[PDB]
Amino acid sequence: STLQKKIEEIAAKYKHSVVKKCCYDGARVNNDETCEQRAARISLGPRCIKAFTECCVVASQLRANISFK
């Protein structure tokens, strides 16, 4: 367990943490604007932008395809 391995572990935790935040931010309902419009106002990294956009797009499809067995 080198120092390299411990830092790579922390770095991966940071990225996963960022993605998780950006995703659920995009997953929030926003009826006024499209996902592309909302993500255009994000000045953060491309990692955050992709997480935001994908979750925003997917969240919208899930909300429109919700049913009851």
Numbering used by the authors: 677 to 745
Can you provide the manuscript's text about this entry?
C5a-derived receptor antagonists have also been sought using phage-display libraries. This screening identified a mutant form of C5a, C5a-A8Δ71–73, as a potent antagonist of both C5aR and C5L2. Furthermore, we determined the crystal structure of human C5a-A8 at 2.4 Å resolution. Interestingly, hC5a-A8 forms a three-helix bundle with an extended N-terminal helix as seen for hC5a-desArg. The final model encompasses residues Thr678–Lys745 (residues 1–68 in C5a numbering) and the penultimate hC5a-A8 residue, Arg746, could be modelled in one of the four molecules related by NCS in the asymmetric unit (monomer C). Despite these major differences, the three disulfide bridges that stabilize the helix packing in all previously reported C5a structures are preserved in hC5a-A8 and connect Cys698–Cys724 (H1′–H3′), Cys699–Cys731 (H1′–H3′) and Cys711–Cys732 (H2′–H3′). In hC5a, the short sequence preceeding the core region (residues Tyr690–Ser693) forms a loop that allows the N-terminal segment to pack back against the C5a core in an H1 helical motif antiparallel to H2. In contrast, residues Tyr690–Ser693 of hC5a-A8 form an additional helical turn prior to H2, allowing the latter to merge with the N-terminal helical segment into the long helix H1′. This arrangement is reminiscent of that observed for hC5a-desArg. Although the C-terminus of hC5a-A8 is shortened compared with hC5a, it could be traced almost entirely for all four molecules in the asymmetric unit. In this context, the structuring of hC5a-A8 into a β-strand motif extending outside the helix-bundle core could provide a mechanistic model for the two-step binding mode of hC5a to its receptor.
Upon complement activation, a cascade of proteolytic events generates the complement effectors, including the anaphylatoxins C3a and C5a. Anaphylatoxin signalling through the G-protein coupled receptors (GPCRs) C3aR and C5aR leads to various cellular responses including chemotaxis, oxidative burst, the release of pro-inflammatory molecules and activation of the adaptive immune system. As for C3a, C5a activity is regulated by carboxypeptidases that cleave off the C-terminal arginine residue, producing the C5a-desArg molecule which has a distinct bioactivity pattern and generally a much lower potency than C5a, in part owing to its tenfold to 100-fold decrease in C5aR binding affinity. Here, we have reported the crystal structures of the human C5aR antagonist hC5a-A8 and of the two murine anaphylatoxins mC5a and mC5a-desArg.
